[PDB]
Design an enzyme around this catalytic site. Structure first.
Site, PDB file in Angstrom:
ATOM      1  CG  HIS A   1      -1.909   1.185   1.090  1.00 53.20           C
ATOM      2  ND1 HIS A   1      -2.686   1.483   0.220  1.00 53.20           N
ATOM      3  CD2 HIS A   1      -2.043   2.195   2.207  1.00 53.20           C
ATOM      4  CE1 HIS A   1      -3.435   2.469   0.651  1.00 53.20           C
ATOM      5  NE2 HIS A   1      -2.997   3.112   1.776  1.00 53.20           N
TER       6      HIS A   1
ATOM      7  CG  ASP B   1      -0.150   6.498   1.994  1.00 53.79           C
ATOM      8  OD1 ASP B   1      -1.052   6.014   1.580  1.00 53.79           O
ATOM      9  OD2 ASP B   1       0.461   6.330   3.112  1.00 53.79           O
TER      10      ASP B   1
ATOM     11  CG  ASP C   1      -4.316   5.365   5.617  1.00 50.66           C
ATOM     12  OD1 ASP C   1      -4.404   4.981   6.709  1.00 50.66           O
ATOM     13  OD2 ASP C   1      -3.416   6.165   4.816  1.00 50.66           O
TER      14      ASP C   1
ATOM     15  CG  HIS D   1      -6.081   7.462   1.667  1.00 55.89           C
ATOM     16  ND1 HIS D   1      -5.543   7.038   0.361  1.00 55.89           N
ATOM     17  CD2 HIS D   1      -5.029   7.157   2.673  1.00 55.89           C
ATOM     18  CE1 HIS D   1      -4.341   6.304   0.663  1.00 55.89           C
ATOM     19  NE2 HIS D   1      -4.100   6.508   2.099  1.00 55.89           N
TER      20      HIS D   1
END
Lengths: 940, 940
Positions: A220, A222, A333, A548
């Site tokens: 994952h 970001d 998240d 997010h």
């Protein structure tokens, strides 16, 4: 009991060999691309220089390249040995062994890691490795070897560790102890012949209710976080390379990617040889794209158009050579979830969803982890929920049986769920010893199916084939209506409103030019008229900051400046450039054009005199006393009282001090009035506090039917100074009794009570909102419109909006500087109950006026026979490739009335089409279901 | 560890002496009053005969009297000994030692008990004791004695018992063990001199954070239960006598009584010497009347008038010599609580409340046991809540420290709460050894205030003085809006509707004649006109069956026949006699009088043709398909589908079998129609099931504006046969999405969601209601009117009414026999949203027409200038002593609108007066608060 005798002894204490090559080693640093540095290497003498030792550094944004030229020692002897080179992992970088440059190899994995040298080709090669700084010094040494000896050491380390996790009451714990015993016997007195032999004896000691335990290695990432996008763009290429080297080493491995744009990032950076790498990789097996989504974002703040593009523009890759996909939807998240998601999923051709947080294990009127989500729309969503251990359970996991027990309790099913890899960082690593992990777990438990079987190579697609069989189709099932509620970590959501002000204004602005630009199609034909290629590039840059983590403003100071940079700004600047562009050859048919989108007093006696309502601030108090309707008869006592309470927590969550009195802004005020007119009335009242700071709000409104409007407008302007770690709010107590709070969510209106669920933990209760929130017994109430603030709270029926927040997080830009805030208070009636919703959301509209030379007639109302006040059309846009356009509508008022849809057009045809802009053969419904999104497509 | 050595040894194993007197003993039995049998004793030879032995019996409703004439043995020797007579407690009876008859003594206490003979007077007396049968044979023997020896035996028994309760880790457990050791030493070898000496040594071994532990001995008596009222009327006199003999034996004792009528029951039965007993007893100390309430009842089913009389007619005793009271309100056995109770309490001059069930210990958004209740009206109620141990914790309690620990966890305060006495039976006993209980607990813990002090003699009045000090006045406090929810044990609530049909019809009927009988005041003057003394006696009999246990119909078969007896019936028969009485000299001014109270088609094509709406049952299916509004546009699919599921539990709670398929009543139906007319339309469709039974519902309604009405009327007639243990319901699925369910509670409308609280336990979720329940997003919905059924449920928005229930409890009248049921389904609109509430509640009205000879004019509308559609006046009545009348109003629609009250009258004056009919100096409010009860009084 010999517990610390077996466990801590042998765990601490040809074979592993360490050789040192000082020469041939080069180092490089840029204090000022892999393709650019390859031309700068062999030519002359550049900043590339001999290192041969450990190189210390200091804090910098610079990256330090490193070159190791290694000659294979002897011929045969050290060839059979395993060749390895250990590096100390820095903040970021890449590792290459290029000729000229073929490869790209993985770096971003944890501080411990292995780099294998090919034993197939005998010769000399090169190594290119850079280290991102933020300093971290690298420890680099060549390591030779054996594989069988190190295997036993790892297997034993995972053995005794599993012995501790196993119940002491079971014989398995006493067994594993004796297994850790016999191994330590021959391992202690330094004997290679004994170790290799004991490894065989241990395997003999190993091998001698239907359930399944599986997992999928995932990363994952970001795209914007405490490290920037440009730097993390180099971080994503390290995630792919770790899999590529793992594929040849181990089969059946599974990887998933939440970013569809991740493909494009790799295709842009490595277009040549790595475009042909993905096709055998993705098509055959071992790779799955989850959700096919362009962005991973919080769904509460933006509109459905943001959720519409990410599906459509993420499905664009499917048109290329791609398209092995999964039905799972992944937002681990993401804080909070929309209630329209069950409706959006089925239409997007994606039937499954995953949620990390926002759940509890108990009888909640809810059974378990696994859940079938029924939205307020009536549609159902089958979703797969990980346990309370979240995604950090299987992340960097050598502990084996440890979290295996804690996974079984929240979940029933026939099987559990495990997510491998870390979701916190520049990107998650994937360990290379997972091959042994699956194998050693097959050593402890036997084979064949009696006891639960261990397979890490199964895909969620086959997992969803199992849920269709075992459990019933269902009528009465796990049921939770609306959203989910757990500790939200709202935090920065209401903090740093300035990045919201820029985005929310850019939100509507980019949502502005979309449809009407297709209304000029007839005017000047070429392709006719629409910024198809132009507006496509626009949505590329905007969705990048909508992620997010990025959107709420939780991040370091460096990328925070990149949020207020042209990235957000130029979007508005380019859109305001285009709106003044397209008008030139369009508005020329308009002499004087008013452009708006739709489809059909006293001081001492303290009064502002008009018919509609009365709102009065008492003298010297500074607090509004009486808001009262004459016709309705409702009188209010306790309005608009600003409240300031400090905050002692970080950016993530919000924790107030224990019973801390919130300081009122009431003070020895003075009275004043901005202007004098029937058109314009603004009365000014000053507020002040300790460590003097000027907190200003404004009062604007139009009287009745000379000014006309039903709603007040109050905008707040505050320049922060001095004291930090404070949280500012303005209270609007209704003085009324209601067990229900009317609030408009994304594409609809959700129904939430005045009191939080009885399972709620955190004291402070605050709710994120789009525009307005109301309290209605349907005969009356109070409506509050607001701007740039997405947060609010339910106090026991006291309306409180959050103006600003200043966290103690390492960000100095969340503390001080000016802010422009705006909100409103509106009177409510049963007849105006549908009006307040209509006067709330889109009020963000900005008046603009411009005129060209005059030839023409400027009045045309082009909309065809719909006229539904209970419905609101959020988005109508064109397609990709034709240029067919789509029309998406949703019902504002639902749960009571069934909206009859007469919506249609002329000169063309129309068919119902889902959110993915994919052709669907039911036709246009004559009646819309309550809380239903109606999307259609238009063809020539 | 010598755990079973000390505990079970000495606990099992002048001084106690047993003498037998066979002669002089008489027995008596009635197979066919204490004052009647005293004249039948000495005269001749009656059924009173010599017993002298144990007398066996058999099941009967008879009571068996017993006479023991005892002569004091010797003179001095056995006089110093404690005189005692042991009896075996039967179902019921009384015990007397009358000369001629002064005394009344306690019986109903547990099977073990003591009767002390007076040592003051030396001579011979008599004993009168009767035993109620239901058989229980009595064991009667004279027991002499010493008091010091038996004291040590009891103190030791409560010692070792306290040793087990104390934590083994503490030294106190090891201490108490050693205390149980040294005592057993001299106790074992049968030595009187050692026992008396060891008792002194034990006291020496005894005596060597501010908190308080208290309790109040109380008796909760159900006036009608598995034993009848006439028999339990003898049971209540046994509760008073146990205190009277305890007062002289022990001081500081506290007793409380939930029945104000309990006084009258004693004053009617024993008017002579026991009227003068109560005055020194109640006035000085040791007695408190809780709530001053005439009845203890469930507040959900009846109206506010039932709660109005019990306060007022229970305050009538205060006018007599009485009136030492408490601010506590006690409803321990009452299932569920109204939301208007916080408003009713403050007006009744009672500031505290007690609740047994309906609570949980956790963070619920709720701290603890102690609670400040804020109703939906906005008013606050400070209430004292016992722990999860309820009232059975201190009931018959010799266990000392046992429940002392479990009491401290749910409660914080500065102190805990204990309720002594049993609430299950004919009445609760009060133990005579409580004197030693308080003393021995003062033996273990020292004196002075450091550690918690033990006082059982404190009164709740002083306890409420402590809560006013320690805790803050408060703003943010424990808060729960509306009612409370835990396992309800609804049970008989929906079972045996026939006793509801009689009561609910008697409810309105007794509520009918009340006010209008004061409107004839001017016509014929004497006192003017009102059945002041007549209607007062009416409410005496009605409230008797309205008690919490009696009203729902949970009871034995004997008293159940007394529910359908004239007790319920004659009330209707006397009221229908009076309504035909008062009319004679009244209606004579009316030629033809319509009397109502207020203040201003096809078969094969399957249609009933009219304008307003359309409701269609499909052919051969038996299930309604389409209920659809043309103007509104809402279409329904899944109505009125009857569902039958069995029940495997008792009368108390309701427990369905695990995943049991509910049998549909659909079958090969036939079509028929009752009558043919525009005025009358009823279409008949038959339903049948296995073990054939005829289930009939009817269809009635008035068309539009020849018939006029907005609502359908559907009445169900079913005669039960064969299979028992079944639960019948009819489903009305709305096919709509709403998170809120509109329901009208007692005096108002409460707001409850579609889903039960997440802390809910029991699977089946059902809600008790008054008349109707709705689901409204305010633009539309579905309204369901019903009769004789107080229950309903929320299925995920499927409206389900409970027609009948047949428990497995030992009651054969809950199974079979005919039933007449009635309900309705109503269309909802935003404009009719206030109309549906108005057309629901009072629809129970029955049309009646009668005419006298003609002289006069019959049209007078006497109401003066109010006209509020959002308000509804439930009750207006007269007073006790003048004959001033009171007016009580309450707002139907609240939570949104603020109702302006212009309500007033002419020719007289008016002042605001509380629910107790007590004079209150704010005056008549010009505007009513949302959800507020407005009560006033009228004077000449």
């Amino acid at each position: 009991x010999x517990x610390x005798x077996x466990x801590x002894x042998x765990x601490x204490x040809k074979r592993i060999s360490l050789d040192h090559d000082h020469v041939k080693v080069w180092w490089y640093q840029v204090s000022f691309s892999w393709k650019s540095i390859i031309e700068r290497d062999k030519k002359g003498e550049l900043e590339f220089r001999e290192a041969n030792i450990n190189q210390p550094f200091g804090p910098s944004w610079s990256t330090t390249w490193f070159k190791v030229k290694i000659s294979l020692p002897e011929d045969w002897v050290k060839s059979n040995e395993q060749l390895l080179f250990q590096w100390d992992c820095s903040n970021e970088g890449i590792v290459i062994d290029p000729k000229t440059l073929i490869p790209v190899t993985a770096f971003s994995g944890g501080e411990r890691t292995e780099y294998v040298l090919p034993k197939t080709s005998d010769g000399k090669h090169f190594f290119y490795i850079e280290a991102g700084n933020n300093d971290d010094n690298r420890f680099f040494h060549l390591r030779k070897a054996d594989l069988d000896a190190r295997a036993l050491y790892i297997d034993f380390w995972m053995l005794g560790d599993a012995a501790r996790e196993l119940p002491g009451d079971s014989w398995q714990k006493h067994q594993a102890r004796q297994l850790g015993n016999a191994v330590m016997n021959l391992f202690d007195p330094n004997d290679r012949s004994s170790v290799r032999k004991c490894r065989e004896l241990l395997q003999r000691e190993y091998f001698d209710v239907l359930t399944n335990v599986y997992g999928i290695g995932n990363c994952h990432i970001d795209t914007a976080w405490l490290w920037p996008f440009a730097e993390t763009r180099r971080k994503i290429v390290r995630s792919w390379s770790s899999q590529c080297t793992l594929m040849d080493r181990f089969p059946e491995y599974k990887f998933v990617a939440s970013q569809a744009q991740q493909f494009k990032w790799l295709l842009e950076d490595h277009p040549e040889f790595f475009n042909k790498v993905l096709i055998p990789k993705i098509q055959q097996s071992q790779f799955f794209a989850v959700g096919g989504t362009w962005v991973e974002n919080d769904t509460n703040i933006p509109s459905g158009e943001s959720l519409a593009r990410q599906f459509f523009f993420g499905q664009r890759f499917f048109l290329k050579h791609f398209g092995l996909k999964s039905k799972i939807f992944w937002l681990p998240d993401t804080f909070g979830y929309s209630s329209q998601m069950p409706q959006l999923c089925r239409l997007s051709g994606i039937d499954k969803f995953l949620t990390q947080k926002l759940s509890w294990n108990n009888i909640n009127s809810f059974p378990h982890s696994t859940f079938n989500w029924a939205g307020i729309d009536g549609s159902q969503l089958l979703t797969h929920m990980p346990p309370g251990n979240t995604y950090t359970a299987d992340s960097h996991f050598g502990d084996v049986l440890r979290t295996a027990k804690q996974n079984k309790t929240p979940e029933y099913y026939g099987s559990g769920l495990m997510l491998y890899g870390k979701g916190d960082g520049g990107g998650g690593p994937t360990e290379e010893m997972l091959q042994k992990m699956r194998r050693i777990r097959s050593m402890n438990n036997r084979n064949g199916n009696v006891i639960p079987k261990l397979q890490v190579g199964i895909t969620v697609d086959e997992f969803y084939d199992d849920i269709l069989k075992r459990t019933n189709q269902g009528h009465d099932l796990p049921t939770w209506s609306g959203e989910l509620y757990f500790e939200f970590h709202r935090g920065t959501y209401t903090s740093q409103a300035q990045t919201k002000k820029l985005m929310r204004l850019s939100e509507i602005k980019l949502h502005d030019l979309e449809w009407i630009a297709a209304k000029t199609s007839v005017l000047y034909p070429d392709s006719y008229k629409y910024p198809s290629k132009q507006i496509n590039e626009l949505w590329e840059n905007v969705l990048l900051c909508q992620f997010h983590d990025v959107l709420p403003g939780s991040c370091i100071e460096m990328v925070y400046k990149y949020e207020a940079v042209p990235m957000l700004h130029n979007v508005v600047k380019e859109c305001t450039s285009l709106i003044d562009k397209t008008v030139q050859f369009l508005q020329s048919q308009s002499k004087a054009d008013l452009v708006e989108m739709r489809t059909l007093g006293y001081d001492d006696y303290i009064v502002l005199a008009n018919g509609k309502l009365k709102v009065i601030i008492c003298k010297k108090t500074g607090v509004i006393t009486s808001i009262t309707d004459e016709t309705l008869g409702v009188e209010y006592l306790d309005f608009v009282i600003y409240d300031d309470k400090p905050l002692g927590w970080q950016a993530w969550d919000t924790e107030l001090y224990s019973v801390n009195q919130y300081k009122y802004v009431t003070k020895p005020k003075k009275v004043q009035v901005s202007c004098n007119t029937k058109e314009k009335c603004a009365v000014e009242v000053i507020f002040q506090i300790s460590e003097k700071c000027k907190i200003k709000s404004v009062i604007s409104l139009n009287a009745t039917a000379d000014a006309k409007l039903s709603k007040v407008d109050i905008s707040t302007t505050v320049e922060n100074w001095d004291a930090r770690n404070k949280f500012l709010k303005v209270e609007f107590p209704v003085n009324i009794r209601n067990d229900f709070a009317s609030y408009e969510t994304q594409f609809g209106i959700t129904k939430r009570p005045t009191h939080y669920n009885t399972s709620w933990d955190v004291a402070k209760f605050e709710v994120c909102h789009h525009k307005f929130a109301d309290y209605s017994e349907y005969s009356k109430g109070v409506s509050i419109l607001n701007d740039c603030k997405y947060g609010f709270s339910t106090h026991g029926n006291l309306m409180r909006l959050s103006l600003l927040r200043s966290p103690k997080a390492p960000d100095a830009h969340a503390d001080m500087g000016t802010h422009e805030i705006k909100y409103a208070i509106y009177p409510h009636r049963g007849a105006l109950s549908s009006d307040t919703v209509k006067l709330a959301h889109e009020f963000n509209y900005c008046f603009k006026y411009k005129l060209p030379k005059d030839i023409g007639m400027n009045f045309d109302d082009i909309i065809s026979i719909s006229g539904d006040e209970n419905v609101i059309l959020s988005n109508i846009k064109r397609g990709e490739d034709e240029q067919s356009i789509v029309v998406r509508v949703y019902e504002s008022l639902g749960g009571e009335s069934f909206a009859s849809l007469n919506t249609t057009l002329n000169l063309k045809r129309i068919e119902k089409v889902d959110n993915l802009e994919m052709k669907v053969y039911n036709r246009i419904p004559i009646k819309l279901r309550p809380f239903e999104i109606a999307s259609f497509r238009l063809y020539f």
